[PDB]
Amino acid sequence: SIKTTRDRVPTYQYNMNFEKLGKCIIINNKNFDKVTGMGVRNGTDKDAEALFKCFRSLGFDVIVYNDCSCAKMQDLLKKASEEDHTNAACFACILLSHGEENVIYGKDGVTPIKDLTAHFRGDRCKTLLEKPKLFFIQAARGTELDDGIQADSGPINDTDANPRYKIPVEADFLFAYSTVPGYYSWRSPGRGSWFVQALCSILEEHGKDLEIMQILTRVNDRVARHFESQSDDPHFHEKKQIPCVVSMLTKELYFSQLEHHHHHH
Amino acid sequence: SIKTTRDRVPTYQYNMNFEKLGKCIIINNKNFDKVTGMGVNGTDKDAEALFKCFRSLGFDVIVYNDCSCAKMQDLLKKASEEDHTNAACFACILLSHGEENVIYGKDGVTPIKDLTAHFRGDRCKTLLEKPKLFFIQAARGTELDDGIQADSGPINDTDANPRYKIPVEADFLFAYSTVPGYYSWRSPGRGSWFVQALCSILEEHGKDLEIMQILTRVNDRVARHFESQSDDPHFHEKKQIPCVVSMLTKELYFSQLEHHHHHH
């Protein structure tokens, strides 16, 4: 049919009618131990700060945790799952650190995303069932030492035997991964990552009128446009990156209910 | 408040003004070589439903059957070698046995990362900035085990990290489904839930809903097949759900943008 706008709409959206939108954990890891070999994540602060203001505006009970250790990160995530979200619309976790294969970097070493998400896997955490659990991740690979002076180094193979490369496809889970780096500066003043900046800019302008997928998509195109334009300075170009969205959502996500938000004096 | 000019067209949709909607390759694998240890039912119904569905959607569908890994890898490549300039988008549906980051051909297994890689921008420039949809139905294969009484039942894994199974590039969209077929006791194949869901929801809203909307509805549709139909905490169907990976940079609508350009 043509031009059809007259119907109840709808039972196709996640229910937001709750005392609170939900909690938003923001793990902002900028400094990693030497035993790690990872460099300082500049701008991660700008990011985190931007994410804080942004998600807070959406109505998230956000808390920022910095330089968390694998044990710490795992700890708080498990604690959050431990809580009662009966009067919450959803949950959101944001990770800002170095990224490898299926794992995020902690203050000390590396911890698999699988674990962080485990705490909510199906059965666990019944108070969040039927509700979205959002994971926004920004974990690019390390900048390394870039060759330079030849030093003494050697990889060691000895762990507590606990491989976790699965990140199970559970319902009502959404992931917005980003491997797009950002540190092409001399003094490294930190101007924030493209992804974060996009995710924030767009979110704090359509986070109340657009559905999650719409936003995330615009963020994608936004970040995309960066690899379609110049990067200044000759022979200084980078390989194209693009955020990734994995959605196991079963409804439309809207950080609103009805009407608009009051901003008038 | 950050920008006040109002330029929303909204030019946030993939331009569908083309001669054709695009090609839709359907690889329907139903029979495999015994060496693969893989079994044969219901896929033909799925293929038929898809072909019809995507056809009425406007696609130019082509159905392949019982393909080898070479053939699967081959035809997909040639396809990226064609000129898609007159096409709005591209679609490929794979129906076969699944394993980790690999899909089964008739004679073996081949990584889906290779099947799709063929359309990466710098390999298929005629589809640059154009949606490349990949719908996949590849549940893990197995034989119906039921006889001697045991204290343990079936066991599986949920290993699925879309990175080594997707060529993370702009305008790529994947809808994986590892849900089996079940009903392998006496009742014939009725088609996978995912496929039926997709087609069904596509018939009714294929030209009025945005792809993610459609796909999300399919997720829920498929998900509802695990309400709470059980008696004792032991004999129950393992809850499963399809996974949607999007690298799309615009909203995808299978219809044509009507008369616009009119705002004050």
Swiss-Prot record, chain A:
Annotated consequence of substituting Q230D: In esCasp-7 V4 mutant; promotes specificity toward alternate peptides with VEID, YVAD, WEHD, LETD or LEHD sequence
One MF term in the entry's GO annotations: peptidase activity
Subunit structure: Heterotetramer that consists of two anti-parallel arranged heterodimers, each one formed by a 20 kDa (p20) and a 11 kDa (p11) subunit. Interacts with XIAP (via its second BIR domain); inhibiting CASP7 activity. Interacts with BIRC6/bruce. Interacts with ATXN3 (short isoform 1). Interacts with HSPA5.
Outcome reported for the amino acid change (mutating Q230C): In esCasp-7 V3 mutant; promotes specificity toward alternate peptides with VEID, YVAD, WEHD, LETD or LEHD sequence
Regulation: During activation, the N-terminal disordered prodomain is removed by cleavage. Concomitantly, double cleavage gives rise to a large Caspase-7 subunit p20 and a small Caspase-7 subunit p11. The two large and two small subunits then assemble to form the active CASP7 complex. Can be cleaved and activated by different caspases, depending on the context. Cleaved and activated by initiator caspases (CASP8, CASP9 and/or CASP10), leading to execution phase of apoptosis. Inhibited by XIAP, which directly binds to the active site pocket and obstructs substrate entry.
Subcellular location per the Swiss-Prot or TrEMBL entry: Cytoplasm, Cytosol; Nucleus; Secreted, Extracellular space
Region ranges (Loop L4): 228-242
Active site per the UniProt annotation: H98, A140
The entry's keywords: Acetylation, Allosteric enzyme, Apoptosis, Cytoplasm, Hydrolase, Nucleus, Phosphoprotein, Protease, RNA-binding, Secreted, Thiol protease, Ubl conjugation, Zymogen
Site (Involved in allosteric regulation) residue list: R141, Y177
Residues of the full protein shown: 47 to 303 of 303
Protein name: Caspase-7
Impact upon substituting R187A: Abolished ADP-riboxanation by C.violaceum CopC
Propeptide segments, given as residue ranges: 153-160
Region named Loop L1: 30-41
Region of interest called Loop L3, as start-end residue ranges on this chain: 180-192
Source organism of this protein record: Homo sapiens (Human)
GO biological process: apoptotic process; cellular response to lipopolysaccharide; cellular response to staurosporine; defense response to bacterium; execution phase of apoptosis; fibroblast apoptotic process; heart development; lymphocyte apoptotic process
Cellular component aspect of the GO annotation: cytoplasm; cytosol; extracellular space; fibrillar center; nucleoplasm; nucleus; plasma membrane
